[PDB]
């Protein structure tokens, strides 16, 4: 009665959302983009190779300077690289070898990492003594730290295996906000250009738009037949792309509240590990679990090129804030810069 009436009311509001969404589905992106000139062939060349890591690399993240990048690795070390010079600005050894994520702070002063240890250890690059000292241990999560991104030197968002996210204040070491609503481990996230919004990808094969300000789920997107492994925003901030284990990518616009485009191929069968946009966003760079990283036309949805420079799974990849270069980490213990 009380639970079935709420269940039957629930299942009516859902078809109101499908009908409110189907109404806007007037034309597809494949129709509109038929006319625009195809993107062509993005013939890419491996400019740099970043050697030194001893085991699988689990994460990396470009700095706001578009020159420095951190990388976390299964070998338990957190190295800071100079992309331009290839030299290691820092080689920080970690307390837990099962690091899974890293995030250069936008300010460039802080770097964070974490993993199965259930803690987001914050590190200071510019230390009092010039050392690499741990500023904070953001503990409290009941699951492995799956990903995290700095809002500033004093604020940082982290996702975990507890099926929830949380906003933290670095100084207090306390969960400012907790983003409940996901029903699975959160594999990845991406902050909107406005620090008030961020998206998150989960194993429940759904995405959710969160308001950093408030901490509530604003919209819920579906379409993937498998876990969401990677997610990122469209440059403008009105759309975002998701990577999944169903061997397909999808584009979602916030305003249209539905899928616009699918990026997939019959040959492509393995799951997606990572995604990134070019500075303009016309290019979607998707990492794959076949040592390859195929280049899609974001508008045409046609595979413009392929980056195949890894000997093992292409675990992670990124794009500079200026789009000047693309890094791609992999299970081969090597990252690779592209131009």
């Amino acid at each position: 009665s009380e639970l079935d009436q709420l269940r039957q009311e629930a299942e009516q509001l859902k078809n109101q959302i499908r009908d409110a969404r189907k109404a806007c589905a007037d034309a597809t992106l494949s129709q509109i983009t038929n006319n625009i000139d195809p993107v062509g062939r993005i013939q890419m060349r491996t400019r740099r190779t970043l050697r030194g890591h001893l085991a699988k690399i689990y994460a990396m993240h470009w700095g706001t300077d578009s020159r420095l990048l951190v990388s976390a690795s299964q070998d338990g070390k957190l190295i800071i690289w100079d992309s331009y010079t290839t030299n290691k600005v820092h080689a920080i050894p970690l307390r837990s070898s099962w690091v899974m994520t890293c995030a250069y702070a936008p300010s460039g002063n802080y770097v964070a990492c974490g993993g199965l240890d259930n803690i987001c250890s914050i590190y200071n690059l510019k230390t009092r003594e010039g050392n690499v000292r741990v500023s904070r241990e953001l503990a409290g999560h009941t699951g492995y730290l799956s990903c995290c991104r700095f809002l500033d030197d004093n604020q940082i968002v982290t996702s975990s295996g507890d099926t929830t996210c949380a906003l933290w204040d670095i100084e207090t070491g306390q969960q400012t906000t907790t983003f409940t609503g996901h029903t699975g481990d959160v594999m990845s996230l991406s902050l909107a250009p406005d620090t008030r919004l961020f998206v998150s990808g989960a194993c429940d094969a759904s995405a959710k738009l969160w308001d950093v300000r408030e901490g509530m789920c604003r919209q819920t997107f579906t379409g993937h037949e498998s876990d969401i492994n990677a997610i990122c925003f469209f440059p403008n901030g009105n759309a975002f792309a998701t990577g999944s284990d169903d061997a397909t990518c999808r584009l979602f616009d916030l305003r249209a509240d539905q899928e616009l485009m699918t990026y997939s191929h019959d040959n492509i069968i393995c799951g997606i590990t990572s995604v990134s946009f070019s500075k303009s966003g016309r290019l979607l760079l998707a990492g794959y679990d076949d040592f390859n990283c195929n280049v899609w036309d974001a508008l045409k949805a046609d595979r413009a090129g392929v980056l195949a420079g890894h000997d093992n799974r292409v675990s992670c990849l990124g794009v500079t804030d200026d789009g000047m270069a693309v890094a791609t980490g992999s299970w081969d213990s090597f990252l690779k810069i592209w131009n």
Binding site: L6, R7, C24, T28, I32, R47, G181, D253, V326
Partner: protein, 64 residues
């Protein structure tokens, strides 16, 4: 064990009410908006437009 299923089902219906109470935009305009963004920033993306090797820090020069 009704207080949990009900407390959960209420969050669900209170959440779905949040998500459904949004004024969406026609996909055509949603696309046009995104397409016209790339059209604008196509020059400012060296990944899209190959830039001169001289401007590339990763090819022309070793000193920085």
């Amino acid at each position: 064990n009704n207080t949990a299923s009900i407390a959960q089902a209420r969050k669900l219906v209170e959440q779905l009410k949040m998500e459904a109470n949004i004024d969406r935009i026609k996909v055509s305009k949603a696309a046009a908006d995104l397409m016209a963004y790339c059209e604008a920033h196509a020059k400012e993306d060296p990944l899209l437009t190959p830039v001169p090797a001289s401007e590339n820090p990763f090819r022309e020069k070793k000193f920085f």
